Design an enzyme around this catalytic site. Structure first.
Site, short mmCIF file in Angstrom:
data_model
loop_
_atom_site.label_atom_id
_atom_site.label_comp_id
_atom_site.label_asym_id
_atom_site.label_seq_id
_atom_site.Cartn_x
_atom_site.Cartn_y
_atom_site.Cartn_z
N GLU A 1 -47.59 -30.93 37.65
CA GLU A 1 -47.65 -31.50 36.53
C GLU A 1 -48.13 -30.41 35.23
O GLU A 1 -49.34 -30.03 35.46
CB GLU A 1 -48.39 -32.88 36.25
CG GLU A 1 -47.88 -34.09 37.46
CD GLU A 1 -48.69 -35.14 37.90
OE1 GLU A 1 -49.90 -34.73 37.61
OE2 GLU A 1 -48.25 -36.06 38.46
N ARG B 1 -51.35 -28.75 36.30
CA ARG B 1 -52.03 -29.15 37.50
C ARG B 1 -51.55 -28.23 38.52
O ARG B 1 -50.59 -27.63 38.78
CB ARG B 1 -51.44 -30.56 37.97
CG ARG B 1 -51.84 -30.87 39.37
CD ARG B 1 -51.65 -32.49 39.42
NE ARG B 1 -51.69 -32.87 40.99
CZ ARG B 1 -51.42 -34.16 41.26
NH1 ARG B 1 -51.35 -35.13 40.34
NH2 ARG B 1 -51.56 -34.58 42.56
N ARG C 1 -61.23 -39.04 40.79
CA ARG C 1 -60.59 -39.36 39.52
C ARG C 1 -61.59 -40.43 38.68
O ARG C 1 -61.54 -41.43 38.91
CB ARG C 1 -59.48 -40.11 39.87
CG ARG C 1 -58.44 -39.20 40.97
CD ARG C 1 -57.66 -38.05 40.00
NE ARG C 1 -56.66 -37.62 40.91
CZ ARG C 1 -55.43 -38.05 41.08
NH1 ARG C 1 -55.18 -39.27 40.51
NH2 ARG C 1 -54.65 -37.60 41.83
#
Length: 520
Positions: A375, A391, A455
């Site tokens: 990404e 990414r 995350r």
């Protein structure tokens, strides 16, 4: 005695409860929680607060005292379908309330303590018309136990500012279990437009019953219109809806015409398995994920039938070709650009871009930027030069590359694999021009989980020197909570940043931040 944690997580405006503080004490010599005192003077728009509440949570399992938890369980959920707005009644007993408070809030509990660990938490509840820019400060004055002040240990910052947010999409909204992949842009009319996967059956990726949804705001992101579906294949060609998923969308505004484009990956068939493993080489719907788009010419209100562009840009040797999730850009010269990624014949992901020179009639791709990348988001620093932030599957650091030839050749950047840490996750990058912001400066905005692992700590960062440096002073962390991590930035107006992300509070969380707050 008395351990305190103040939260740094978005306060959902429409929520009936929000976690403000956690408290933990081992009640060896303590009998009764008398009261807790806080100062909200320092808040801006204190009038926006509906209530401040005190709740008694549990005690702890005896064997687990060493875990030093601040709570036995999550008191409010962001995942229970249609149940994300209020504290789960069986986890918490309300022991005090302060309605429409002034600066000084006294929460009188007078609560018999359990002989062992005791948990309490404070809840903040806003009024419906709360301003996006309302800021709540809540300084802990005192904790009284048994007629006298206790010693508190508060390792959390003392200058925390609780920011406002709207849960654009909550788990269960319109019959969908989850909403995942955020993309956010601002139209020429100033209209905000949020797109996402609507993942009806579960939160699982790619092949499943998945549409791309859209929320549209005409008031700066304070309210959002009934959900629309730009892309949705249903029972296409007589396959079940769950074998016709489309998601991971990216959105751009055509700044020359205000035409809005969303691109997404349509996966046909593939059973109930992951399309990252299920898309195979070839070109047709039987073989491989399709690259499809929709367009709006009425400011996002209505949308065209899908447009399959797979033939135009997909190499048949590749297993999988799709957009980079989030947003695209219109260049200085009017070119339209979407970040891209493909899994090659060797099964390796590669980030890149695609472009259209004809208001989106035809699209074209040249070469990859870097091997083993997924990404990415792309930005125009100067006319004709594009910066691709990606990414990176190796370590935990955003990879950066530069192209002055729309992807034929690539130049690595000085910041690449060093300036921006990631846990291998999507990140958002936008560029703002001096004339288009109140700082009259040229800036790169960036948002991602600010860690190499987990995350969480979704954080907005700004660069003033073309992405070479990112000064702590020009950062803001929105959410210390664990979430799914994706985010997308936009300029709401000339002075205001917008963010749409997967928070620990809601699947689709919107927040607005004054440029001057972040930079100064």
């Amino acid at each position: 005695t008395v351990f305190v944690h103040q939260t740094q997580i978005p306060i959902l405006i429409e929520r009936q409860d929000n976690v403000l503080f956690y408290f933990r004490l081992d009640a060896k010599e303590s009998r009764m929680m008398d009261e807790i005192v806080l100062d909200f003077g320092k808040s801006v728009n204190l009038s926006d607060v509906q209530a401040v509440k005190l709740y008694y949570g549990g005690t702890e399992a005896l064997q687990d005292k060493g875990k030093k938890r601040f709570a036995p369980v999550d008191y409010i959920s962001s995942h229970r379908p249609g149940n994300t707005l209020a504290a789960i009644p069986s986890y918490s007993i309300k022991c005090a309330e302060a309605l429409q408070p002034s600066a000084k809030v006294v929460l009188k509990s007078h609560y018999k303590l359990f002989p062992g660990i005791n948990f309490f938490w404070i809840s903040l509840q806003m009024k419906p018309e709360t301003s996006l820019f309302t800021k709540i400060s809540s300084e802990l004055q005192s904790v009284k136990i048994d007629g006298k002040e206790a010693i508190c240990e508060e390792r959390s910052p003392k200058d925390i500012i609780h920011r406002m947010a709207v849960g654009v999409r909550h788990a269960g909204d319109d019959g969908s279990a989850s909403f995942r992949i955020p993309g956010l842009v601002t139209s020429n009319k100033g209209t905000l437009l949020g797109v996402y996967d609507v993942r009806y059956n579960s939160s699982v990726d790619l092949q499943e019953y998945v549409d791309v949804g859209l929320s549209r705001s005409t008031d700066g992101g304070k309210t959002w219109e009934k959900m629309r579906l730009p892309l949705s294949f249903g029972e296409y060609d007589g396959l079940p809806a769950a074998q016709n998923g489309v998601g991971d969308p990216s959105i751009l505004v055509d700044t020359q015409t205000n035409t809005i484009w969303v691109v997404a990956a349509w996966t046909h068939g593939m059973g109930n398995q992951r399309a990252w493993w299920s898309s195979h080489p070839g070109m047709d719907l039987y073989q491989t994920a399709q690259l499809v788009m929709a367009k709006s010419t009425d400011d996002g209100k209505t949308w065209s039938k899908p447009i399959n562009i797979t033939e135009q840009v997909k190499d048949p040797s590749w297993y999988f070709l799709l957009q980079g999730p989030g947003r695209g850009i219109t260049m200085s010269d009017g070119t339209l650009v979407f970040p891209t990624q493909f899994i090659d014949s060797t099964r390796v992901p590669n980030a890149g871009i695609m472009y259209s020179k004809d208001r989106g009639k035809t699209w074209k791709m040249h070469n990859m930027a870097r091997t083993n990348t997924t990404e990415a988001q792309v930005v125009e620093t100067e006319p004709g030069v594009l910066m691709l932030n990606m990414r990176d599957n190796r370590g935990g650091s955003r990879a950066v590359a530069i192209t002055k030839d729309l992807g034929k050749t690539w130049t690595e950047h000085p910041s690449s694999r060093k300036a921006l840490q990631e846990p291998v996750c999507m990140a958002s990058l936008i560029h703002v021009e001096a004339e288009d912001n109140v700082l009259d400066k040229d800036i790169l905005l960036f948002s991602n989980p600010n860690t190499t692992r987990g995350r969480n700590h979704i954080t907005i960062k700004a660069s003033l020197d073309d992405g070479l440096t990112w000064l702590p002073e020009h950062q803001l962390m929105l959410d210390e909570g664990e979430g799914w991590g994706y985010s997308c930035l936009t300029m709401i107006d000339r002075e205001t940043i917008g963010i749409l992300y997967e928070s620990s509070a809601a699947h689709m969380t919107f927040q607005a931040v004054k440029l001057k707050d972040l930079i100064r």
